[PDB]
Symmetry: C3
Subunit: 40 residues, 3 copies
């Protein structure tokens, strides 16, 4: 396993992706996943 902290999480209503900036190595890694975006 290789779990590292997320430093900052953003999401994006025009790509329907959330992006997690990872605390690892040279700082250039992210995790990204697909999401639904809506008003509650």
């Amino acid at each position: 396993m290789a779990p590292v902290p997320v430093t900052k999480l953003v999401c994006d209503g025009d790509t329907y992706k959330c992006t997690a900036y990872l605390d690892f190595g040279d700082g250039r890694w992210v995790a990204q996943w697909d999401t639904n975006v809506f008003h509650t």
Copy 2:
């Protein structure tokens, strides 16, 4: 043109519905990103 991503102010995962919901820093605070998740006990 492209809209920059917005910060998430609050992340809640609901074990009842198998959804995580990220509250977005946008408009009136009622916008969310939501996705399906697995929920389990560690061990």
Copy 3:
């Protein structure tokens, strides 16, 4: 607590609930910018 893993391609959120041993986990893409 929220962590992500480039080996398993999963992000994991540690939930406060109950005895603190529950997690939410989901599939992700992981890549270098």
